[PDB]
Amino acid sequence: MISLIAALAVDRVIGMENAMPWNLPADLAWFKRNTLDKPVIMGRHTWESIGRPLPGRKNIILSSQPGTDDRVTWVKSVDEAIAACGDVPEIMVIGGGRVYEQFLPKAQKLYLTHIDAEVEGDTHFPDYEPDDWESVFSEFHDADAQNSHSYCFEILERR
């Protein structure tokens, strides 16, 4: 099964200057939790942003271009990336703007962290049809000392 996991701020903004503006440790904890032990797929930019493999997970990187680090698996297409994962229960696309657009069509579930923060960005999450998605999990959280905004963890499974 393929899955997208992401954090959308106001107006589906997900990144800016190769970084998630807000600071919500609750979110990352939630990322770590739902990605742990599962193949994860991302774009070259998103790789350049983390700089070091994500631990206890197979890291696949989509790049039309050759491979610059061997601590990870490089692939040149979406088909090549899913195949690179082998036959596993769930595949986590921690994607990237463009990586989400290509994978959304094959996704069976979406892990969305909706952030009540309004920052500007140069990268958005694909504009998906809510109609053809079911809400199976949704937990709201007020802002606290560690997290300055209110957020909601949401899990959608394609109908």
Ligand X SMILES: N=C(N)NC(=N)SCc1cccc(C(F)(F)F)c1
Considering only residues 106 to 135 of the shown chain, the ones binding ligand X according to CB under 6 A are: 113
**Which positions from 38 to 57 touch ligand X by CB under 6 A, shown as an x/- string?**
-----------xx---x---
Rounded (5°) CA angle 153-154-159:
170
67 is in an annotated binding site: no
The two three-digit tokens of residue 93, written as one number: 């696309």
Q: How far is the CB of 55 from ligand X (least distance, A)?
A: 9
119 is in an annotated binding site: no
Which residue has 């996704």 as its token pair? Answer: 107
Rounded (5°) CA angle 133-134-137:
130
61 is in an annotated binding site: no
CB 55 within 8 A of CB 61: no
In angstroms, what CA-CA distances link 157 with 4, 61, 68, 130? 11, 25, 35, 11
Q: Which residues bind ligand NDP (CB under 6 A)?
A: 6-7, 14-16, 18-20, 42-46, 49, 62-65, 76-78, 94-99, 102, 123
Binds ligand X by CB under 6 A, chosen from 6, 9, 91, 104: 6
> Residues at the annotated binding site?
5, 7, 13-19, 27, 45-46, 52, 57, 63-64, 76, 95-102, 113
